[PDB]
């Protein structure tokens, strides 16, 4: 009947359908990540699944350190994600060269989301089937999370999640914050925040993990980066 | 079928459709007759008497001259007729500019058809729902002539012709009366020829007509409403019984 | 008989000779067995017994073997009404069938339904052909009134099985009935040998045991997988006219037949 | 019954006089000399408590009574719909004085657009089976009709006039506190609950509600406690219940659809 | 297969069904009236809605302006109406600065209409559904009154109307009109029609607005007067609603 | 039950209406409520927010936005077709009016520009409109205060007091019964809340809303002091603590 | 049954009905002397609640001929090719009684315009009554049979039905004028009571042309606002109360602020 094979057609009840399919096309990986702030930092974890035994696991990654003091963790299939991470690695030249200093995260989500808005008014491109999560350590407002989406409803969560297990993680997280009545997490050490995060989520869904089945990102001030299999026993050491 | 909803496809009989559907639009319009005597041309119209709220100070006018030795008449729909009239008179005054010489009538007539050929060929475009005809004299000669044009983009040279409602009654009529065995000479018989030709349509209303004629030496002359009203009567004067 | 088996209330398949769950099956123990067992409380509170349930999830879970099985414990009549096999192109006659069965169920004293693939009822209506979609609600809406009208019985229970939950959003039909909506599982790796212990029985096979089976059963977590592996692993000991299974055929079976159970 | 219904302090009155009073007291209508009415119509959104009121009237009418929901009319073989409809009104006048109930007509009672089909054209003449009966050459003085619908602004005006529907009635919205306090007291009082009775803590909330959701919350709250190997009473920790009656959160198309 | 999905298609019956489906849009719009008479032209209006919490008091809707000479009345869509007048207000000034005098009203509409024809064929685009009225004064033709049509054909009328139920309003104008009216014969006429063919019985001052052209400039050109409410609520009570 | 003409937006039906602009407005309803009132000295704007996940920092988003120091806006409808609309708007305030007339626009010559951003959507096919309907409030020295509305069809009204979104017909009924033509400012705020009470769910505090006003000069916001006539804004939005106390009455 | 004193509201229409009906029956000799034609049946269109069916039950009370009725869609039938049989077995029952009026209240169920994608037996039985009225043997049937049909809006139908030769008149039943609306009050009121110091034209002029049947609703309802209080008699202010009310809700959903235009 139409109404579905095109983007720019409203249904008579108001809701269009094609983006809603893309909102649903994120979780073809069966992956679920997690982000959480600190006192001066922020961290992001990411589940891994490399079932076949011929992939150099070092290069498979849904992480893209776009520049200094910025990070990003994606859902949706990988190829669309590279097609977004590139544009991020392009603007951070421009905003620096054009306006002088480095991009804050909030703008970088605001800018990027307008681009995926413009692909809900015309058939230039299809909309990317991604929903991606930037992190940083701001020079003014401090650590920050922002949760983009295809259509372009970005917001700043204090500590959020994604994947097919959002309802569950949505349950236990907010239970934690009300046991202390605080948005962020204390205990400065970005190291020790990992031990907080991972144990908060193994018990959430209920499965123990190895070192060769996760990847993590850490957001200190002055730099963002990734880490290999160091610090993979203190969660059970004590 | 589906072969008739565009301009860039052929039916299996070989003929396109959106063009000759225009010939059904022009059939829905008013008459437009023309005749050439030995040394003078005439032109008619099936003007309407619609209602008593159009300003008598400005009667409408199918006819519209483009230069002092050429005129034009049409039928179909007026909006798409307004354009090529303005692309015509523009083109003529350019030919006076570039060449220091007025227009041969044949050159003009191939410009209006030279647009009715592109406005059907290249899609993204609708044709001109109008047929027209040209009338006048070449410079420096008395050679009379009128040319017809139609949205397929072809130009002919009739000696007498009509377009629109009950044209079929008329184009057979003048064949029964007009003929090259005896070409008329001056105005009062070319007009006495024509004013009777309209009568298949006019149903005896003389507030429903206008008329013009043609001069040599780049002139024209219009005509009045009583200056036909007598000609309404000499043509009826024969109709005693 | 005309339509369905009805199980004569006693054909006693084992609801526990199965590698399913204990929590869910005990969640169902509430809504069915407790009143029919123990009306002294719902009476004491005056609440009417419950109105049906949904069991989402895709197959392999055994979301129909438990149903008739627990029905066999209590002893009601188990039937079908697959909505894929209920639709009829004519204007009515999709609702007539609904009207027959609520009546014909009551022709029997107890009776319980097993609808399946009920998304055929609950469609998004993206086509919006009003000659059709005006009727799709017409037969659907008749269900809503045929199901809970004057029927004050404690025998006529309802079930609806619906793979692909939440595909329906013309109406979620939430308020009132559907007193449970069970959070269905999939077969966990622990449950594999809980399941393989089921079908392996009634065999003389020199054991045919292994811990290399859940790894083989990883991602092939559907009950048909185990039913069929025990099938074809049974067909390989006879491939050479042997006398008893070897567990390598199991390590061969699930490894080499979950292929179709993972690609298509 | 009536006493089983809660806050219909207004609506309850109009039909128990438009139905019961005539057959018990009609000589006084004509003691003026007028013809009384024949049809009514009950339009309000679902759960507002309409289909059950007639069931109260069913218990107390001392007349006949007929139940036909609008989907029951149609069949595949045309022509039989109307004769079924004709079979109704003849049955009524036979077992007179009688009345009729319908629980939904929006599948029928519509605007009568310009049809170009068989489906959309055959539904219409069903509706015509009503009009030629309710006012034609052959009419009577014993039948009355109780229509129904979840909403009434589309069904054709030719059905909506006097002679047909002399008295149609509205229903409340879902945000009107007075009756809400009246329902919880009604339903809860029909059975035994706790002394710790925080029901004057729930009414005050801004949320919109029906008479249907209330049957859900107070039942499924009666579920969780009876499920607790308990006997009667419902604990004041039914805060699960009210928040469990938040279906907007359970609508992803009301969560991640338009944006 | 019926011939309406695009406006670049003649029908086999010889017609363009999309354009008729635009000329019917104005029927949804609000009434507009103009009368031509001795002293100067008058116009009227009727707002489609007359509710409470929106001010139609200082905010004119149906009566924009194009120059101190010329003023119009508007109907139809609103988004496809502003851009026309925001073109007309340009073309006039771009006729002034080059020729150092004012505009003749005939050229404007001739230039404002032939663009609507442009949005009829060349492209798969909407035709602007609007039915302006033109009111103004030029020296070569004196007082003037034209009318448009989203096809692109105009007409020089004496006193006509458009919008809801004009077909009846004309009948209330055809027979009870006199050319020698000065001003107020047209006023009590005009305001009597809208009183007859309305939707509701209010006729409140907010519901309608007037305007005027007048040659009362004693050898100066012309004046306008777009009436505030205090000049039109006092006149209808001064006229006998 | 519509067919064959809502498919696009460039085919007039025989009835004589365009296809899906009528259906864009259907979402405008399904968005959250909104309102705005014209006083004799100021204008107000207000919306709630049903923030889906409470973990969201609701302060980051802002229903209300800036256009000038003197003009402000709000929608009732789709979100992401707003936060781009404003940058496409205030970019026009500069290049169109300011840099060729020196100073900032009035409201209507800033609203008329918004429309020409809108109608450029409904010009062709397969290019949708904006799923929003706005209202604008501002002030000038020529005619003073005004309260306008903007629809996706390019049209733009004026108003005096209005609501839109879900609680549109219900609210606008109440406003007709709780309004005067010669009232003051502060009572207007005492209306909008209890108007906003009409179609509220969840909480009602100052955290779960955002409302703004306009009025007399607020030169404390200026920061560039030392000039006689370089006067400061007529715009400021009210803090939750500045609202949560007003709610106490 | 009802009578002509009760169908007040007009005379021009009803004075055109027996222009075709009563005259040929009683007095065809002048019309055979004049000897020109025989004008057959009639159609009467109008909005609902106007008195269409009412005139058709009265006329039977004042006819002296036989008056056959078919209500809405009792000719469309399940099996095939007997709907026609249900028709041609009708008219043969008429000609037994040579003066025979028939009546069919509504035709928009049957006589709607034809298409091919759908509409079967109904578009067939219409395609033989259309024969019976003006065919060879229809010329025989054309002698004395007369027809009345009462649609609601006629643009739907074919022209062949309302084509003359068989439909010689097409009457309009529009909603009335003030005095027409004013009288039928009395025709629905005279039973009532010694109504006390009352006018009824000042209230009709309040209610502009809505319909006729609505007026039967205000009067019956007005007594009901007096019936509750055991106030057997009737008031004035109860009337302009009710008529001001029952049309309000009819003027309630007419509003809309879409306004994509002007
Ligand atoms: N002018 C009138 N005189 C007498 N009764 C009237 C008049 N107008 C309306 N009525 C009343 O209205 C009803 C008749 O409605 P009407 O006949 O106009 O509709 P209808 O033609 O029966 O509708 P349909 O035939 O399409 O079903 C009767 O109850 C009648 O008393
Ligand atoms: N938990 C289980 N344990 C053992 N076998 C199972 C289990 N679930 C399903 N099965 C097998 O799968 C079959 C049931 O298929 P099922 O998944 O119920 O189909 P559907 O989901 O369409 O009802 C049974 O015959 C059984 O052998
Ligand atoms: N006042 C009330 N008290 C108790 N239950 C009510 C009340 N009003 C409505 N209900 C519930 O709502 C249901 C009726 O829904 P309803 O709106 O009548 O749907 P429909 O009209 O389509 O049948 C009943 O089953 C009843 O349990």
Swiss-Prot record, chain A:
UniProt record similarity statement: Belongs to the peptidase T1A family.
Official protein name in the record: Proteasome subunit alpha type-1
GO biological process: proteasomal ubiquitin-independent protein catabolic process; proteasome-mediated ubiquitin-dependent protein catabolic process
Keyword Oxidoreductase: no
Annotated PANTHER family: PROTEASOME SUBUNIT ALPHA/BETA
Subunit structure: The 26S proteasome consists of a 20S proteasome core and two 19S regulatory subunits. The 20S proteasome core is composed of 28 subunits that are arranged in four stacked rings, resulting in a barrel-shaped structure. The two end rings are each formed by seven alpha subunits, and the two central rings are each formed by seven beta subunits. The catalytic chamber with the active sites is on the inside of the barrel. Interacts with CIC1.
Location of the protein in the cell: Cytoplasm; Nucleus
Role played: The proteasome degrades poly-ubiquitinated proteins in the cytoplasm and in the nucleus. It is essential for the regulated turnover of proteins and for the removal of misfolded proteins. The proteasome is a multicatalytic proteinase complex that is characterized by its ability to cleave peptides with Arg, Phe, Tyr, Leu, and Glu adjacent to the leaving group at neutral or slightly basic pH. It has an ATP-dependent proteolytic activity.
Organism (species): Saccharomyces cerevisiae (strain ATCC 204508 / S288c) (Baker's yeast)
UniProtKB/Swiss-Prot annotation, chain D:
Record key words, sorted: Acetylation, ATP-binding, Cytoplasm, Isopeptide bond, Nucleotide-binding, Nucleus, Proteasome, Ubl conjugation
Record has Nucleus as a keyword: yes
Covalent cross-link (Glycyl lysine isopeptide (Lys-Gly) (interchain with G-Cter in ubiquitin)), residues: 111
Keyword Repeat: no
Modification after translation: N-acetylated by NAT3.
Residues annotated for ATP binding in this entry: 44-51
Entry's Gene Ontology cellular component terms: cytoplasm; nucleus; proteasome complex; proteasome regulatory particle, base subcomplex
Example GO molecular function: identical protein binding
GO biological process: positive regulation of RNA polymerase II transcription preinitiation complex assembly; proteasome regulatory particle assembly; proteasome-mediated ubiquitin-dependent protein catabolic process; ubiquitin-dependent protein catabolic process
Localization (cell): Cytoplasm; Nucleus
UniProt similarity note: Belongs to the AAA ATPase family.
Function: The 26S proteasome is involved in the ATP-dependent degradation of ubiquitinated proteins. The regulatory (or ATPase) complex confers ATP dependency and substrate specificity to the 26S complex.
Annotated protein name in UniProt: 26S proteasome regulatory subunit 6B homolog
Swiss-Prot record, chain E:
InterPro entries: Ntn_hydrolases_N, Proteasome_alpha, Proteasome_alpha-type, Proteasome_asu_N, Proteasome_bsu_CS, Proteasome_sua/b
Keyword set, alphabetical order: Cytoplasm, Isopeptide bond, Nucleus, Proteasome, Ubl conjugation
Subcellular location per the Swiss-Prot or TrEMBL entry: Cytoplasm; Nucleus
Transmembrane segments: none
Highest rank taxon of the organism: Eukaryota
GO biological process, one term: proteasome core complex assembly
GO CC annotation terms, alphabetical: cytosol; nucleus; proteasome complex; proteasome core complex, alpha-subunit complex; proteasome storage granule
Quaternary state and interactors: The 26S proteasome consists of a 20S proteasome core and two 19S regulatory subunits. The 20S proteasome core is composed of 28 subunits that are arranged in four stacked rings, resulting in a barrel-shaped structure. The two end rings are each formed by seven alpha subunits, and the two central rings are each formed by seven beta subunits. The catalytic chamber with the active sites is on the inside of the barrel.
Stated role: The proteasome degrades poly-ubiquitinated proteins in the cytoplasm and in the nucleus. It is essential for the regulated turnover of proteins and for the removal of misfolded proteins. The proteasome is a multicatalytic proteinase complex that is characterized by its ability to cleave peptides with Arg, Phe, Tyr, Leu, and Glu adjacent to the leaving group at neutral or slightly basic pH. It has an ATP-dependent proteolytic activity.
Protein name (record): Proteasome subunit alpha type-3
From Swiss-Prot, chain G:
Species this protein is from: Saccharomyces cerevisiae (strain ATCC 204508 / S288c) (Baker's yeast)
Protein name stated in the entry: 26S proteasome regulatory subunit 8 homolog
One GO CC term on file: proteasome complex
Annotated function: The 26S proteasome is involved in the ATP-dependent degradation of ubiquitinated proteins. The regulatory (or ATPase) complex confers ATP dependency and substrate specificity to the 26S complex.
Changes after translation: N-acetylated by NAT1.
Lineage of producing organism: Eukaryota, Fungi, Dikarya, Ascomycota, Saccharomycotina
UniProt superkingdom: Eukaryota
The protein's assembly and partners: May form a homodimer or a heterodimer with a related family member. Interacts with OLA1, TMA17, and UBR1.
Residues reported to bind ATP: 46-53
Keyword Acetylation: yes
A single GO molecular function term of this UniProt record: ATP binding
Biological-process GO terms, alphabetical: chromatin remodeling; nonfunctional rRNA decay; nucleotide-excision repair; positive regulation of RNA polymerase II transcription preinitiation complex assembly; positive regulation of transcription elongation by RNA polymerase II; proteasome regulatory particle assembly; proteasome-mediated ubiquitin-dependent protein catabolic process
Miscellaneous information on this protein: Present with 4700 molecules/cell in log phase SD medium.
Keywords (A to Z) from UniProt: Acetylation, ATP-binding, Cytoplasm, Nucleotide-binding, Nucleus, Proteasome
UniProt keyword annotation of Transcription regulation present: no
Record family assignment: Belongs to the AAA ATPase family.
Location in or out of the cell: Cytoplasm; Nucleus
Residues of the full protein shown: 144 to 405 of 405
């Amino acid at each position: 009947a139409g109404y579905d094979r095109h983007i720019t057609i409203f249904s008579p009840e108001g809701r269009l359908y094609q983006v809603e399919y893309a909102f649903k096309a994120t979780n073809q990986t069966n992956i679920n990540s997690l982000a959480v702030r600190g006192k001066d930092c922020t961290v992001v974890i990411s589940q891994k699944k490399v079932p076949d035994k011929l992939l150099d696991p070092t290069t498979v990654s849904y992480i893209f350190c776009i520049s200094r003091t910025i990070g990003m963790v994606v859902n949706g299939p990988i190829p669309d994600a590279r097609n977004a991470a590139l544009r991020a690695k392009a603007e951070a030249a421009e905003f620096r060269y054009k306006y002088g200093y480095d991009m804050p995260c909030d703008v970088l989500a605001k800018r990027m989301a307008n681009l995926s808005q413009i692909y809900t008014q015309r058939a230039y491109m299809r909309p990317l089937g991604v929903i991606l999560t930037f992190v940083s350590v701001d020079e003014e407002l401090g650590p920050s999370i922002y949760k983009t989406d295809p259509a372009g409803y970005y917001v700043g969560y204090k500590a959020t999640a994604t994947g097919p297990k959002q309802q569950e993680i949505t349950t236990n997280l907010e239970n934690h914050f009300k046991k202390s009545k605080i948005d962020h997490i204390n205990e400065e050490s970005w190291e020790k925040v990992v031990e907080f995060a991972i144990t908060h989520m193994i018990d959430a869904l209920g499965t123990e993990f190895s070192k060769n089945d996760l990847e993590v990102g850490v957001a200190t001030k002055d730099k963002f980066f990734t880490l290999s299999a160091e610090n993979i026993e203190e969660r059970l050491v004590a | 079928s589906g072969y008739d909803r565009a301009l860039s496809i052929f039916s299996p009989d070989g003929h396109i459709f959106q063009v000759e559907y225009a010939l059904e639009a022009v059939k829905r319009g008013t008459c437009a007759v023309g005749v050439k005597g030995k040394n003078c041309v005439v032109l008619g119209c099936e003007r309407r008497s619609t209602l008593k709220l159009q300003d008598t100070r400005i009667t409408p006018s199918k006819v519209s001259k483009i230069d002092s030795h050429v005129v034009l008449s049409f039928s179909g729909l007026n909006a798409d007729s307004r354009i090529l009239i303005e692309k015509a008179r523009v083109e003529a005054q350019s030919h006076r500019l570039t060449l220091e010489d007025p227009v041969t009538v044949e050159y003009l007539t191939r410009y209006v058809a030279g647009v009715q050929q592109r406005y059907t060929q290249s899609g993204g475009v609708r044709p001109f729902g109008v047929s027209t005809l040209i009338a006048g004299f070449d410079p420096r000669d008395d050679e009379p002539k009128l040319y017809q044009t139609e949205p397929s983009g072809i130009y002919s040279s009739w000696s007498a012709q009509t377009i629109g409602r009950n044209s079929k009654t008329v184009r057979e009529f003048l064949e029964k009366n007009y003929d090259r065995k005896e070409p008329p000479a001056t105005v009062e018989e070319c007009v006495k020829l024509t004013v009777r030709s309209l009568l298949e349509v006019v149903q005896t209303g003389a507030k429903n007509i206008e008329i013009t004629v043609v001069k040599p030496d780049s002139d024209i002359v219009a005509l009045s409403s009583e200056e036909i009203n007598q000609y309404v009567t000499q043509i009826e004067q024969e109709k005693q019984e | 008989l005309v339509y369905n088996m009805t199980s004569f209330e006693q054909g006693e398949i084992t609801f526990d000779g199965i590698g399913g769950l204990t929590e869910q099956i005990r969640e169902l123990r509430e809504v069915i067995e407790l009143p029919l067992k123990n009306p002294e409380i719902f009476q004491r509170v005056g609440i009417k017994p419950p109105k049906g349930v949904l069991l989402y999830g895709p197959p392999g879970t055994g979301k129909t073997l438990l149903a008739k099985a627990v029905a066999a414990t209590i002893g009601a009549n188990f039937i079908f009404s697959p909505a894929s096999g209920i639709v009829d192109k004519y204007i009515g006659e999709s609702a007539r069938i609904i009207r027959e069965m609520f009546a014909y169920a009551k022709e029997h004293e107890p009776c319980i339904i097993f609808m399946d693939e009920v998304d055929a009822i609950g469609g998004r209506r993206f086509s919006e052909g009003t000659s059709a979609d005006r009727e799709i609600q017409r037969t659907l809406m008749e269900l809503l009134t045929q199901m809970d009208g004057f029927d004050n019985l404690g025998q006529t229970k309802i079930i609806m099985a619906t793979n692909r939950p939440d595909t329906l959003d013309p109406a979620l039909l939430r308020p009132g009935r559907l007193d449970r909506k069970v959070e269905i599982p999939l077969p966990n790796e622990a449950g594999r040998l809980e399941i393989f212990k089921i079908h392996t029985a009634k065999v003389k096979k020199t054991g045919e045991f292994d811990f290399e089976a859940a790894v083989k059963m990883s991602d092939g977590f559907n009950g048909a997988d185990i039913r069929n592996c025990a099938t074809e692993a049974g067909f390989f000991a006879i491939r050479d006219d042997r006398d008893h299974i070897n567990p390598d055929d199991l390590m061969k079976a699930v490894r080499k037949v979950a292929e179709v159970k993972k690609l298509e | 019954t009536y006493a089983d219904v809660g806050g219909l302090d207004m609506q309850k009155q109009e039909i128990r006089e438009a139905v019961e009073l005539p057959l018990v007291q009609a000589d006084l209508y004509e003691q003026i000399g007028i013809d009384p009415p024949r049809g009514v119509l009950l339009y309000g959104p679902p759960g507002t408590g309409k289909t059950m009121l007639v069931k109260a009237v069913a218990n107390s009418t001392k007349a006949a009574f007929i139940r036909v929901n609008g989907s029951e009319f149609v069949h595949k073989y045309l022509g039989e719909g109307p004769r079924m409809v004709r079979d109704v009104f003849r049955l009524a006048r036979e077992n007179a004085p009688s009345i009729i109930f319908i629980d939904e007509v929006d599948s029928i009672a519509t605007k009568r657009f310009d049809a170009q089909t068989g489906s959309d054209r055959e539904v219409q003449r069903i509706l015509i089976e009503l009009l030629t009966q309710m006012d034609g050459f052959d009419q009577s003085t014993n039948v009355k009709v109780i229509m129904a619908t979840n909403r009434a602004d589309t069904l054709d005006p030719a059905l909506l006039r006097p002679g047909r529907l002399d008295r149609k009635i509205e229903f409340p919205s879902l945000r009107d506190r007075r009756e809400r306090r009246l329902i919880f007291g009604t339903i809860a009082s029909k059975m035994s609950l706790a002394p710790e009775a925080d029901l004057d803590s729930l009414i005050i909330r801004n949320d919109s509600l029906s008479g249907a959701v209330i049957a859900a919350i107070m039942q499924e709250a009666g579920l969780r406690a009876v499920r607790k190997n308990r006997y009667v009473i419902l604990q004041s920790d039914l805060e699960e219940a009210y928040a469990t009656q938040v279906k907007t959160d359970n609508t992803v198309d009301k969560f991640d659809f338009y944006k | 297969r019926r011939y309406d999905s695009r406006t670049t298609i003649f029908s086999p019956e010889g017609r363009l069904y999309q354009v008729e489906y635009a000329l019917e849009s104005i029927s949804h719009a609000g009434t507009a009236i103009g009368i031509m008479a001795s002293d100067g032209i008058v116009l009227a209006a009727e707002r489609k809605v007359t509710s409470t919490l929106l001010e139609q008091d200082t905010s004119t809707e149906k009566l924009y302006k194009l120059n101190d000479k010329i003023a119009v009345a508007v109907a139809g869509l609103t988004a496809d109406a502003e851009i026309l007048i925001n073109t007309a207000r340009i073309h006039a000034q771009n006729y002034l600065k080059t020729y150092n005098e004012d505009i003749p009203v005939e050229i404007l509409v001739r230039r404002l209409s032939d663009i609507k024809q442009g949005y009829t064929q060349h492209g798969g685009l909407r035709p602007f559904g609007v039915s302006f009225i033109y009111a103004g004064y030029d020296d070569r033709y004196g007082y003037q009154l034209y009318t448009s049509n989203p096809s692109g054909n105009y007409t020089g009328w004496k006193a006509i109307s458009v919008g809801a139920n004009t077909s009846a309003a004309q009948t209330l104008l055809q027979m009870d009109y006199k050319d020698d009216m000065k001003v107020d014969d047209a006023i009590e006429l005009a305001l009597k029609t809208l009183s007859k063919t309305t939707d509701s019985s209010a006729l409140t001052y907010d519901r309608l607005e007037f305007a005027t052209i007048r040659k009362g400039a004693n050898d100066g050109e012309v004046y306008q007067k777009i009436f505030k409410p205090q000049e039109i609520k006092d006149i209808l009570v001064k006229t006998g609603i | 039950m519509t067919d064959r003409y809502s498919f696009s937006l460039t085919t007039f039906s025989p009835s004589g209406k365009l296809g899906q602009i009528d259906y864009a407005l259907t979402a405008v309803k399904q968005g959250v409520t909104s309102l705005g009132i014209k006083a004799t000295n100021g204008v107000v704007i207000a919306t709630e927010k049903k923030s889906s996940s409470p973990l969201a920092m609701s302060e980051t988003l802002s229903k209300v936005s800036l256009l000038t120091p003197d003009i402000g806006a709000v929608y009732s409808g789709m979100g992401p077709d707003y936060r781009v609309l404003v940058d496409k708007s205030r970019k026009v305030a500069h290049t169109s009016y300011k840099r060729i007339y020196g100073e900032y626009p009035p409201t209507k010559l800033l609203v008329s520009e918004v429309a020409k951003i809108m109608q450029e959507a409904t010009q062709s096919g397969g290019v949708r409109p904006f799923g929003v309907s706005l209202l604008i409030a501002g002030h000038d020295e020529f005619n003073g205060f005004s309260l306008y509305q903007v629809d996706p069809s390019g049209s733009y009204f004026p108003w005096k007091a209005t609501a839109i979104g879900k609680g549109s017909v219900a609210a606008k009924t109440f406003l007709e019964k709780r309004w005067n033509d010669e009232l003051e400012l502060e009572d207007a705020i005492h209306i909008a809340l209890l108007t906003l009470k009409e179609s509220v769910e969840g909480e009602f505090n100052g955290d779960t809303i955002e409302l703004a006003i306009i009025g007399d000069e607020n030169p404390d916001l200026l920061g560039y002091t030392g000039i006689p006539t370089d006067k400061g804004p007529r715009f400021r939005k009210l803090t939750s603590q500045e609202i949560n106390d007003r709610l106490e009455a | 049954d009802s009578t002509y004193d009760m169908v007040g509201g007009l005379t021009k229409q009803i004075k055109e009905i027996k222009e075709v009906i009563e005259l040929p029956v009683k007095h065809p000799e002048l019309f055979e002397s004049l000897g020109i034609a025989q004008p057959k049946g009639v159609i009467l269109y109008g909005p609902p609640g106007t008195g269409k069916t009412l005139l058709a039950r009265a006329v039977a009370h004042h006819t002296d001929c036989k008056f056959i009725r078919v209500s809405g869609a009792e000719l469309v039938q399940k099996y095939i090719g007997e709907g026609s049989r249900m028709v041609r077995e009708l008219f043969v029952m008429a000609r037994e009684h040579a003066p025979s009026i028939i009546f069919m209240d509504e035709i928009d169920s049957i006589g709607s315009t034809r298409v091919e994608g759908s509409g079967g037996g109904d578009s067939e039985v219409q395609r033989t009554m259309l024969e019976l009225l003006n065919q060879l043997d229809g010329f025989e049937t054309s002698k004395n049979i007369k027809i009345i049909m009462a649609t609601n809006r006629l643009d739907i139908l074919d022209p062949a039905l309302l084509r003359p030769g068989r439909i010689d008149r097409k009457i309009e039943f529009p909603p009335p004028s003030v005095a027409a609306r004013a009288e039928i009050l009395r025709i629905h009121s005279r039973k009532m009571n010694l109504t006390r110091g009352i006018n009824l034209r000042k209230v009709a002029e309040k209610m502009n042309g809505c319909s006729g049947a609505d007026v039967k609703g205000v009067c019956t309802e007005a007594g009901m606002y007096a019936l509750r209080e055991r106030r057997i008699h009737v008031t004035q202010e109860d009337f302009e109360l009710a008529v001001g009310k029952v049309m309000n809700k009819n003027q309630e959903t007419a509003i809309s602020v879409a306004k994509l235009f002007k």
